[PDB]
Structures are given as C-alpha cells and as structure tokens.
Symmetry: C5
Subunit: 312 residues, 5 copies
C-alpha cells in the first residue's frame, strides 16, 4: 500500500477536521488536560480506482489495512495518540471520509492572573509527515470541525472552537513544515466563588473592625488577635482549591492587603491604650473616632485601585 | 471474513446485553468510574448451516477467526476496552452466539446540587458501524441484561439497571449509526452524615447562642469569636470529603447562612455593650431579650425556605 | 489445542493450588489489597502420553504454548493478572504439571462495626467455563496451599489461609461453570491505637471537667471552649481512618457522645452563672457539687453500655 | 538458540554482580522503593567460544538474539523488571560479559522504631531458571559488585553493599534452591530533625511551665490551655513527614508523655487555686514552690529511662 | 540493514544534537523532571552511498526500515524513551538528517539550600552502543543543540543549554567508551515569595512585639501566646509549598530563630510581672524599656549573620 502517485504536479490538498467528543481532567499544576475526540481526514484520491462503475454506486467500507491513511503527528502531547479507528466510508469515486476516536494528554500554558474572572485558550498543533510523492499541504475543512455539544468540563463554559494556518517557524526548518492551530476558548464560572470565599472574609474583617467602638484593652486584644487566627485558618481552607502559582495574583494581593490592615489595626489599638494610660483621653478619643471612618474608606479605595491595576 | 448477503428484508439485527460483575472507583472530581462485565452478541447468518443429517450430532461449532463478527465500540470511554473472546457457537439454523469480557473507564456527568440526599444516573453508550453490503441495527436482549449480587460501591446502593434504544444519526454524523443506552441508578447512603456533620455544627451554634443570657462583654467576645474559629475548623473537616463543585449546592448555602448568623450575633453584642456604656440599660435589656427569641425562629424559617427551594 | 474427548460422559478435573508470598497495600477506603503468589495446576489428558521405555525419559517438558491449557480467571479483580509461566511437565500416563507467578489487586468488602478491634475475611475466587463438549470441574490440592513464614502485612495478624473444597456449580450466559473460594483470615493489632488516640481525648475531657471546682465565669468559659476547639482539632488529626459507612461504628458513637457531653457542660456553666447573678448562691453551689459527681459516673455508665451493645 | 551442552559434568557457574546507580522513591507507607541499577553476568562458555583466533583477537559483539541468555528472576518485585540491554561483548575465546539497565519496584520490610536514629537493610533475592543440561548454579562475583558512588539516596548514607548465597525455602521443587541475597545497609542523617522537631516542642513545654511563678488563675488557665492547643497544632504539622506506622515508636512515646505532663500541670493549677480560695495560702505556696523543681527533674528522668529502654 | 563498512579505519563520527521542546513536572521529592524534546544525528555513509547521480538533486525520503539507525541510550532515565520518528531525509551527498520526539523521565540531583534564591543544573547523559565494524565516536553538533524559545517550567527561567564531551568514568569500562553531558541551567523566580511568605511572618512577629509597651499581665500573655499559635498555623500553611528536605535550609533556620525569639519574649514578660509583684517597678521599667530597642536590633544582626553564613 502506497499513497496516490503524482498526476500533473498539482500539490496534494488535505482537508482535516477535529470533532470534539470529551474534554476532562484539566490539571493546573501539571498544566495539562486530557482530551477525547474524533478526527477526520478527507484527501482527494484520484488515480486509485474505487469501482466507479454505475452498477457499483454502493459506498464501500474499507479497513485500515486497505489504503494509505495519512499519519498526522501532534506536536504538544505527552505520548503518541491511540488510534481507535472508528469508521471509513469511501464513495465509488476517489472521495474519502474517515472518523477515529483518540485520547491524548495535551500540554498548554495557563495564565492564572485575575484568577476568579479569567479566560483561557487551549492549543492543539498538527504537522504532516514527508512522503516520496508530491508535497502534501494542510487545509481546514470547515464542515468537519466542531464539538459534540456534550463535552463537559468541570467549572468552565466553552465559547468557540476554530482553526487557522500558522507556519511552524521551527529552528530546524528542514522544509516549510506547514502547521495547524486549533484554539479552544473557555471561560470560568465565578458566581459560586463570591459566597464561597469572598463574603466570609469581609464578615471576618468587619468583626475585627468592631473594636473601634470599644475601650476595654483586653477585649480589643482578644478581638483582633483571634480574628487574625481565624483569617489564617480561612486562608488555609481556601488554599486547597487554588492551584500552585509561582507569580502574583489578584487574590494573593487581596490576602496581603488584609494582612497589612490587621497589622495597622493592632498598632492603632496599642496607641489608643498607651495614650489613655498616659492620660490624654481627648487625643485617644479623637484618634478612635477618626479610625471608624478612615479604615473602610481606605479599604474601598485600595480595592478600586487594585481592580483597575489588574483588570486594565 | 465477509459480510453476510443482504437478502433479508429487515436490516441485520443483533441482540446485545451487558451483565455487570462489579463496579468500583467512583471518582467525583473527574466524574468517571470503572466497570467489569460481559458482552453477549447474537445474530442470524444463513450463509453457513449444520444439518442434523450426515453425522449431524455436532449441533454447535466454534469458529474463532474464520467468521464475520459485528464490531461494537463504546462511546464514552477514556481508552478502548480490553476484551478477551470467550466462546463462539453456531446454531444449526444459522444464528450465532458471541461472548466477551471487558474492563473500562466510563465518563459520566454528576450532579451534586443535593449533595447528602442526591441520586445519580450512570450511562454507557454502544454503537455499531455500517457496512457496505448489508445494514445492521442494534437491539436489546432482556434475558441477558442484569448484574451479580456481589456488585458494591462504597457508599451507594444500586436500584436498577435497564436499557433503551436511542435514535440513529446521532450528533452531526448521519451514516445511519444507532446507539444504545444503559442506565444504572444509584442512591447515596446518608444516615452517617447526620451524627458526623449536622449535629455537631448545631451544638456549636447553640453554644454560641448562650451569649444572650450574659452581660459580661469579655465573656461574650470570647464565646462568639472562639465558636467562629471552631466553625472554621469544622468547615475544613467537612470539606475534606466533599467533592469540589464549581457551582452552588445545599451545603454551601447552609454554611454561608451560618457565617451570616455569626456576623449578626457579633453586631448585636457590640450594640448591647455600647448602649450599656452610655447609661441606657433598659434599651439594652429589651434588645437582648428580643434577640433571645428572634435568633432561633429566624434560623428555623430560613432552613425551611432553603429546604423547600432546593427540594421543590 | 483441543479439549480431550470424554470416554462416555465424564467431566474433566483440574486440581489447583495457591501459595502466598506477601500481602500489602490493604487500603481501607477503597476496600482492596494487593498480592503476588504462585499458581499451580494439574489435569489429565490421555492424547499426549508416551512410552517411557522407548523415549528413554520419565517426564517430558513442553513450552508455554502449543498445548491445551485451560483458561483460569479470577472473578473479583480490577484487571487481569500478570502471569509468567515457569514450567510445563508431563507425566507418563498423561497428567500435566504447571506453575506460574502472578500479581493482582483484589476487591473485597470489609466490616468496621468494631473498627479498632475487628477481624476480616478476604475472598479470592477462581472460575472456569465449559469449553467445547468436554465439561470441566475444579478441585483443590491440599499440599499446594500455603504461605511463607515471611508473609507479612503492616498492622495485621494472619491466622489461616484455606480453600473451600466444594465448588458452586451454576449456569451463566447459558453455560455451566464452577467456582472456588480462597479465604484469608486476619485480625487487626489494636495496641498502638490506645496511647495514640484513646487516652489524649480522655485527658482533654478531664481538663474540660476541671471547671466544676471554679467560680470565675471567664475562666470557665475559656476552659470549656478551648477544650472544645482542641477536641475538634484532634478529630481533624484522627479523621484519616474508616470511611463513610451505612451503619454506626464504635468510635463514631464515642465521638458523638463526647460532643454531647461538651454541650451539656456549657449549659451547666451558663446556668450556674445566671443563678449566681440573680443572688441565689446556694442553688448554684448545690448544682455545682452535684455535677462534680454526676458527670464521671454517667460517662462511665454510657461507656459500659456501649461496650456491651457493640461487643455483646 | 540453546545453552551450551555438557562437557565433563562441570556445572555452569554464573558469576553475578549488581551495580547500583539510583535508589529513590522510598515510599514507606507502601513499604517499597524503586531501584535503578545495572546488572552484569558472566557465564563461562568454553567449548562454544566463537571465533578463537589471534588475528581476530578483537572483542566480538553479539546481539541479544544471537547467544543464549540465562533467565534470572527477582523473588520480591511487585512486577517483572523492565530490562534494557546496554552492551554485551564476547571475547574471541573464553567468557562473556553482559550489562543491562533495569528499573524495578522492590518490596522490603522497614523497621520504623527508633525512627530519627534508625538504620535499615534492604534485600534483593535472585533465582535462575534451570534448563535440560547440567544445573545452573549461582555465585557472587565480588569484583563486579559495587555502587556508582553517585547514588541519589538523599537523607541516607550508604555503608555497605555485599552479597551471599543462601538456600531457598518456598514451594521446594528440588531445584531453584540456590537463591542469592543482596543487602544494602543505609543510615539516616538525623541532624536536621533536632531543630525541625525536637527544640520547638521543648520551647512550647517550657513556655507552659512558666505558670508556676504566677498566682493569677485566669493567666494560668490561658497559658496552659493555649499551650495545649499549640502542641496539638504542632503535632498535626509533624505528622505529615511520617508514614502510617501501626506500632509503637519512640516519637509516639514522647508525644504521649507530653500529653500526660499537660494533664498533670492543669491538675496542679486547679489545686493551687482551690486551696487559695479555701483560705489556706501556705499549702498553695508550698505546692507551687515544690512543682517549680519537681516538673523538670521528672521530665529528664523519664526521658533518660525511655531512651535506655528503646535504644538498649 | 547493517552499519556502514570500514573505509580506511576512520571512526564514524556522530554529530549529536538535542533540541528542547517542552520541560514540565519538576517534581522535587522524587528528584525527577520530564522532558519532551527532539533529537538529531548527523552520521553519513560513504561505501553505502545514497544515489550519487546528478539527476537526483531532490532530497530523497526514507523510513525507519531504510538505513541503519544508531543505538543511543540514556543513562539517568527511569525507563526507555518513547521514540517517535518524524523525519529521516538523506541528501545526494551522503549525509543523513534525523528528527524524532521523545518524552523521558529524567533523574537529576537537586540542591534546596538557599531555597528561594537558588539555581539548579540538570544533566542528561548519552552513550552509543558500539559495533564491531568500526569504533563510534560522539561529537557535539553546535548547529542542532538549542531551545524552541517556548519551553515553560512553571516558576523558573532558562539561562543556557550547552553540551560537552566527557569521559565515561564508569568503573565497568566495557569498551573504553565515551559519554556526553547536557547541562540546563535554571534560576527560580523569587518575587512572589516575598509577599506570599516573608512579610506576613514579620507582621505577626511585630504584633507580638507590641507587648513591650503594655503593663497588663493578662493582655501580654494573650498577645504572645495567641501570636505563637498564629505562627504555628502559618507554618502549617507554608509547609505545603516547600519540598520535604532532609537537610538544613535558609527558611528552616529563619523559622527556628523565630521560635527562639518567641521563647525569649515569654521569659521577659514573666520576669517583668514577677518583679512588679515583688515591688521593684524601677527594675521592671528598666527591663521593659531596654527590650523595646534590644529585640529588633538583635533580630536584624542575627538575620545579617545568617545571610552571610548561607550566601557566602
Ligand atoms: C500606621 C503606620 C505604620 C505603617 C506600616 C506599614 C509597613 C509597610 C511595609 C511594606 C509593605 C508594602 C510594600 C510591599 C513591597 C512589596 C510589593 C508587594 O508586596 O506587592 C504585592 C502586591 C501586588 O504586587 P504588584 O507589584 O502589583 O505585582 C504586579 C506586578 N508584578 O501589592 C499589593 O497588593 C499592594 C496592596 C496595597
Ligand atoms: C521594626 C518594626 C516595628 C516593631 C515594633 C512594634 C511596633 C510597636 C508600635 C508602638 C506603638 C505605641 C507607641 C506609643 O503609644 O507612642 C506614643 C506616641 C506619643 O508619645 P507621647 O505621649 O508624646 O510620649 O504616640 C504616637 O503617635 C506614636 C507614633 C504612632 C506609631 C507610628 C507607627 C508605628 C511604628 C512603625 C511600625 C511598623 C514599621 C514597619
Ligand atoms: C433541634 C434538633 C434538630 C435535628 C435535625 C436533624 C436533621 C436531619 C434530617 C435527616 C432526614 C432527611 C430525610 O428524611 O430526607 C428525606 C428526603 C429524601 O430526598 P428525596 O427523596 O429527593 O426527597 C425530596 C423530595 N420530597 O430528603 C429531604 O426531603 C431533605 C429535606 C431536608 C432535611 C435535612 C435537614 C438538614 C438540616 C440542617 C440544619 C443545619 C445543620 C448545620
Ligand atoms: C433550639 C433552641 C435552643 C437555643 C440554644 C441556646 C439556649 C441556651 C440555654 C439556656 C441558657 C441558660 C438558661 C438559664 O439561665 O436558665 C436558668 C433559669 C432559672 O431562672 P429562674 O429564677 O427559675 O427564672 O431556668 C433554669 O434553671 C432552666 C434550666 C434548664 C435550661 C436549659 C435546658 C436545655 C435548653 C435547651 C437545650 C437544647 C434543646
Ligand atoms: C462596616 C464596618 C462595621 C463595623 C461595626 C459597626 C457597628 C458597631 C456598632 C454600632 C453601635 O454601637 O452603634 C450604637 C448606636 C448609637 O445609638 P445612639 O445612642 O443614638 O448613638 O445604637 C443604635 O443606633 C442602634 C442600632 C445601630 C445600628 C446597628 C448596626 C447596623 C449595621 C452596620 C453594618 C452593616 C454592614
Ligand atoms: C443538664 C445540665 C444543666 C444543669 C442544671 C439543670 C437543672 C436546673 C436547676 C435545677 C435546680 O435548681 O435544682 C434545685 C435542687 C435543690 O436545690 P436546693 O435549694 O439547694 O435544694 O438542686 C439539686 O438537687 C441539684 C441536682 C439537680 C440538677 C442536676 C445537676 C447535674 C446536671 C448534669 C447531670 C449529668 C449529665 C451528664 C451528661 C448527660 C448528657 C451527655
Ligand atoms: C486519673 C484521674 C486523675 C484525677 C483525680 C484527681 C487527682 C488529683 C487529686 C490531688 C489533690 C487532692 C488533695 C488536695 O490537696 O486537694 C485539695 C482540695 C481539697 O483538699 P482538702 O481536704 O481541703 O485539703 O481539692 C481540690 O482542690 C480538688 C482539685 C480538683 C482537680 C481534680 C479533678 C479533675 C477533674 C475530674 C477528673 C475525673 C477523672 C475520672
Ligand atoms: C539552645 C538552643 C539554640 C542553640 C542551638 C541551635 C542548634 C543548631 C541549629 O538549630 O542550627 C540550625 C540553623 C542553621 O544551620 P547551621 O548550624 O547554620 O548550619 C547547618 C548545616 N551544618 O542554625 C540556626 O538556627 C542559627 C541561628 C540561631
Ligand atoms: C527549663 C524550665 C524553664 C521554666 C521557665 C523559667 C521561668 C523563669 C522565671 C524566673 C523569674 O521570674 O525570676 C525573676 C527573678 C527575681 O529575682 P529575685 O531573686 O527575686 O531578685 O529575676 C531574676 O533573677 C532576673 C532574671 C533571671 C531569669 C533568667 C531565666 C532564664 C531561664 C532559661 C531556661 C533555659
Ligand atoms: Cl501523535
Ligand atoms: Cl472500545
Ligand atoms: Cl485473570
Ligand atoms: Cl523479574
Ligand atoms: Cl533509552
């Protein structure tokens, strides 16, 4: 079995198409995600007679060991894909339709800045292998490419699934090495994050802030320090869901700002008690009345500035 | 070898059937589980027959490789199943008996919106391919669908296992391909969740609610804040086992409501102390007496509303 | 490559035997364990006997293939075993010898009603199908069943390893089969659980109880609530134990009882303070002196009753 | 091919030798450890030496499928090794040199008593399958046995690696009775454990002991109980770097003794406060002054006794 | 297919080149990392020339079963590489161009002292199996070794990727062969570690230090002990990022010093209270005024000494 011979130096055109079936196991630390999907290759197959007799108009069924099947290699994968060939339907003429389910572990970078409200773009790269016949070119068949409407990823919604031609631009560049890029755009569902992570932190912070309406030093110390312990425990709780991230993040900036605010509150309580002991109650009362307005307003301004700095 | 002649008016009918041996490893994060079962097939082929005459005592015949066998592929499986042929028998008329045994991983969605008191459903899909000469359509054998009594999942009780034929031309492909659906219905065993999760949290909340029978500010602060810390630790303990759900469930709503109640209790304690300091004890007494009855009634009403909203 | 023909109707008998090497990885939540062992077989076949005098030998050897070897399969395994044959020797009359080494992971349910002091039984099943017109039944070789003195498992004591001689013949997929049962009996080593779990919780409970000799309300609140937090943290540290179960175990009942005791202690402290504030010190003193004796006696009685219930 | 034929009843001696390279992934809960190492065999092949000639004195190279390769099995591996032949050379006349790089998962018992200051001993067992010719015997070639001196067994320092021949006692067959035993002695580096574990806990205990210089009941209660909570949290922290050991250990004994000391300290504080309230300050002063000296001395004596009991 | 025959005893020089594509999963406990990358060889054949015709200027095409492919084996890998040939093209001159893809699991030593500001150097070793026709010598091809500029290890940056020829230095010199060394230098990105781990601990320590401006024993005890609990909780939180390291580290030294400072602060508070009770407020005030300056200065000097000790 060999590919079709040359006809008139016309470049051989291959119309590929990837039809998604399943997408699962989106691992962040490994920066991978498994896929389970179909694949279609429709290559013009003249000069290989397929019984074009008008009495043989039946669509012929062929096994993999019947003709030359173009072998496409994925660039960013862990191992070679498993070729679970599904069905090949070939007309009495040189027209080819073919479907095959594969499973692979794909490598694709993920950007986790602006983490709870982020979007991603997964990539799949395809190259074609050399052959002794004329040069093989890559083209996209827009009818074949799609998704199964039943692909479910835990916590995301799928926007689009398109394809485009991009030159490989590899340093080897033994030939042109035409390459295909498949882009899967996904968006994270963020609503549950508000009640799960955001509101409890604000409740704890306000419980801490109730110490500006009091004057008992022991009660203030207990309030602020126990609230700090609760904040650390809640950070431990929320650290499990988040992925390990060796760079700065919006949530991390918020956590750091909360730590800073706790430190400043402790300083304010200490100053108030020291003045009250040294008998300057007017100054102590003025400072403790100023704090009640100062803290929430500065917190709001810092949040606005951080939001602008991280979301354009 | 070759497909049977397409002489019969109806398409070549098969008679599938799945007999469960055991199920195991019901993963929740990736929403997949493993299975081990048989797969019996049956169809009629008049091309070969065994007459009772001419020493026709050999009613059955074993043809391992020199025979045409229909091919059945699972749709929602991570990898292709690993099957070993067991037996092949041929009736004197022409009906063929087939049998296998396989293991696989199955991808199936799960719905944890009633996490403790939820019921699931697991699907297995089968597909037969078309052949050029004849036509093949799937069917079910009610005498070959069942399960052992040793099937067990850790924490679930199995209720039923049935089959139903799905329409052809599934998805966008339209090569007259049929599909079969096998449904396994399970229910979670929820009794152990009550004394392990629900009652201790209620005990902690009731312990925190005893601050309404006291007028010592330091004791009230200690009670409420330390019970908040205990609630956070118990939340860590609870979330250890609950699967991670990127959506809103019943338990998350209950936990958020508990956080809100803690916040309101802190506010009430602060207001009472502030009123007492300004030499207005009657108003503070009235407020605390009102809250003593107000808190449990509102908690019960909110619980009733949530229960009606999620289970109705 | 063919089953032997019967003389008149006699079924064929295969004598098996399993010799353990080491058991390990006895997981509790998944209810599985791993094993590697020797598998021995022997069966009668009169179509391959020779003449010892002419052949000059007494036992003729063979290859792993090119001889009719019965299909032996384990019922409750996740995947097929990993086999590597060691020998196939033939007796002069016709009986054959076989040996191989395998490794597998076995599925078996467990019972945790007496979790610290429980005993388990593990089952390994062997089955065989009726091949051709020669029915096959299994038998047990008592001299090929045993285990090494170096068979060890971390934290368990191995008592016996026997095989039930009588098989259970039945019909499956319109064919007859025979099944064998291998039973391994183990018992948990329970000493290390006493100083690691049992005693620290009692010490913390007594530390909590020490608040019946004090009259300061703040100190009592601190003692009881801090000890409750310590109990919750200890339960977090201990939770790496038995999984969720439909039934109620011994340890869960003990933990729930301790929670109830903490709740009642908080109630008593609050009642004493409330009575003291209303200027009725005599009732508070009487209640405290009563509780000093009431709590330990009721705790001991409840422990005795639970011990009788779960082990009687 | 075939093994060399007998010449003068001289047994074939296979001088073996293992050359360790990597010893890693020491998983103690599973009580295994993966190994990556070479393996050299030299079986004398006289009367079958190929191309003995001074002109062709250059060492000859043979592919693995050119000469007979002995089959050596590992007794205590979870699965069969993944062999990788590197280079096998045959002299013009004489012996044959062989070398393969295999990686295997080995199951060996681990004794975790005396955990910080423990020395282990890993074992590998080898057997060789016999053939129809004279019995294959195993002997250790001391010249090839050794290490790469570049073993990445971090946390341990290798002391020796030797071998010896022992009789085999498992399912005796009058053959396969000449197994080998390779012992790898390792010792744990215990310096970092001192600052990482030992000293913080002593600091915490000494912090708790400062309650014997104070007569404030509330301060003493806060000190002792909060110190107990800190001890529980630090135990949680320590438990991560330690496998599940279902048996008694030196560290566990120390931890239990620390819990006992906390309980006794709480008892002493309560007794002192009760005596002070009962208008008997002299007994309280005597008791606290006695405790100041009594506690550290008893702690030191108990530590000495426990050390002598565990370390001989 | 056999290696090229000798021409004039000239060794067949092989110009090797590794072109990186993907580096991922830098697991530290197992001391491994996975590499997905290309590979190239530039051996030529003189006697077995490839089409020395001037009409064949077009580059010929070959497959794996077309020429002799060298046997190059990695030394420090877990198991054999997953070879995946992509291109094998031969020019009419006689030179060969090769392109494959592999994904191996490499074992390379790592050093985690000076952990947040450290650099690493990963090694890959190559050896080629010799043949009896000639002697094979490995030389580095400088036009092939390189990176794809899109290699992403999460949290590192790539400095250089270079190759060098070194002696084998193995104690078992089978054929006096050679070896290659490929070095990849990476430096950790340390910016996020400051806000993530460093500043919160300083804030907590200063919150502890605010107790030298107070004179209430109860408040001081609460501050210091609760701050110690918070420090332990934060250590638990940050333990999930660091690798399990069985040797000393800069961060571990910092943690130990923080524990020591907490112990000394507790001692100082106890001494102050004891003197104040014993009626020496002058001495108490002197010590408490000295501490305010003594503690930060000693902390700074100790940090400077530790930094000099660990960073030369
Ligand atoms: C009452 C008077 C006492 C006040 C005492 C204040 C002490 C302050 C000590 C220094 C803390 C603040 C400076 C922090 C320096 C390090 C920077 C830092 O932590 O920033 C983290 C983080 C974000 O990092 P970016 O630089 O935006 O990252 C994006 C670009 N890669 O900053 C914030 O969250 C700022 C919060 C306000
Ligand atoms: C090094 C990092 C900080 C380590 C030390 C812990 C911080 C302790 C802060 C002390 C606050 C109490 C001092 C106080 O009350 O001073 C009174 C003083 C007035 O003194 P007279 O009554 O005139 O005498 O009141 C003040 O206004 C003091 C200044 C306010 C505090 C300014 C910020 C605190 C210092 C910076 C800490 C963080 C640095 C990073
Ligand atoms: C004061 C003491 C209060 C003690 C309260 C104990 C609460 C445990 C209740 C367990 C019983 C649940 C039960 O019977 O469930 C049956 C039924 C089965 O589900 P379906 O068949 O789908 O029915 C829905 C359609 N009608 O489930 C329900 O109806 C659940 C309704 C809510 C009951 C659970 C109550 C939980 C209360 C949480 C309180 C806060 C805890 C912190
Ligand atoms: C569900 C709703 C329960 C809410 C959970 C918190 C409630 C707190 C329990 C009451 C605290 C103490 C009450 C108190 O001081 O009562 C003393 C008061 C004495 O005052 P007189 O002079 O008789 O008027 O009455 C008593 O002695 C009552 C004794 C028993 C009361 C507690 C019994 C259990 C309460 C409900 C438990 C949960 C069900
Ligand atoms: C956001 C940060 C919130 C921190 C906590 C703020 C509230 C603390 C308590 C306020 C307080 O004591 O107010 C007493 C105040 C003063 O009374 P006069 O004698 O008229 O003066 O009393 C009242 O008016 C009673 C009701 C006060 C409002 C209750 C709080 C409302 C909710 C505030 C936070 C909402 C988010
Ligand atoms: C439940 C725990 C709450 C303790 C208080 C409940 C009783 C309310 C007040 C009863 C009362 O005043 O009794 C008066 C009466 C006599 O008073 P005089 O005037 O001195 O005569 O007091 C008594 O007789 C004292 C004993 C009666 C109250 C019982 C006290 C002990 C309570 C706990 C019992 C053991 C519970 C153990 C745990 C069980 C659940 C896990
Ligand atoms: C194991 C069980 C350990 C717990 C049992 C008690 C051990 C400690 C008792 C030692 C002190 C008793 C003698 C003494 O001097 O007590 C003082 C004084 C009265 O003595 P007079 O006769 O006035 O002299 O008694 C006290 O102060 C009592 C101390 C209370 C603490 C002990 C209670 C602990 C909590 C209950 C534990 C129940 C375990 C079952
Ligand atoms: C008395 C208790 C405090 C002094 C004893 C400290 C014990 C040693 C210790 O903890 O050192 C760890 C640590 C770092 O290790 P080095 O000794 O610098 O070098 C390690 C490689 N050889 O040292 C320190 O903590 C020094 C700062 C105090
Ligand atoms: C090891 C066990 C450690 C237990 C905790 C130690 C607590 C020490 C408190 C001592 C104290 O308050 O002494 C005050 C004491 C009163 O002096 P008079 O003799 O009254 O003059 O003050 C002093 O002596 C000055 C300070 C010396 C104390 C130094 C303590 C060092 C302890 C290190 C242990 C390792
Ligand atoms: Cl591929
Ligand atoms: Cl399949
Ligand atoms: Cl099997
Ligand atoms: Cl092996
Ligand atoms: Cl390799």
């Amino acid at each position: 079995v060999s590919p079709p011979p040359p006809i008139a130096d016309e470049p051989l055109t291959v119309n590929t198409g990837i039809y998604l079936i399943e997408c699962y196991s989106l691992d962040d630390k490994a920066e991978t995600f498994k896929v389970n999907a179909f694949l279609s290759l429709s290559w013009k197959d003249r000069r290989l007679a397929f019984d074009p007799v008008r009495s043989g108009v039946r669509v012929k069924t062929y096994e993999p060991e019947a003709i030359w099947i173009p072998e496409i290699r994925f660039v960013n994968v862990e191992n070679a894909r498993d070729a679970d060939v599904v069905d090949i339907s070939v007309s009495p003429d040189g027209t080819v339709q073919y479907l095959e389910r594969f499973s692979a572990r794909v490598l694709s970078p993920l950007d986790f800045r602006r983490y709870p409200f982020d979007s991603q773009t997964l990539h799949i790269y395809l190259i074609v292998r050399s052959v002794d016949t004329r040069n093989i070119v890559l083209a996209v068949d827009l009818e074949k490419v799609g998704k199964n409407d039943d692909v479910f990823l835990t916590g995301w919604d799928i926007e689009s699934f398109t394809a485009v031609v991009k030159p490989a631009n590899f340093a080897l560049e033994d030939r042109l090495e035409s390459k295909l890029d498949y882009q899967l755009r996904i968006s994270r569902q963020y609503f549950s994050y508000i009640p799960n992570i955001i509101l409890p932190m604000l409740f704890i912070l306000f419980i801490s802030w109730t110490a500006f309406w009091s004057t008992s030093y022991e009660a203030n110390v207990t309030l602020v320090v126990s609230t700090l312990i609760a904040h650390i425990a809640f950070n431990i709780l929320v650290e499990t869901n988040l992925p390990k991230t060796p760079y700065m993040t919006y949530t991390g900036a918020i956590i750091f700002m909360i730590y800073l605010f706790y430190f400043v509150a402790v300083i304010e309580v200490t100053v108030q008690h020291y003045l009250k002991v040294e008998s300057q109650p007017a100054r102590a009362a003025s400072i403790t009345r100023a704090s009640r307005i100062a803290f929430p307003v500065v917190f709001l301004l810092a949040n606005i500035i951080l939001a602008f700095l991280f979301f354009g």
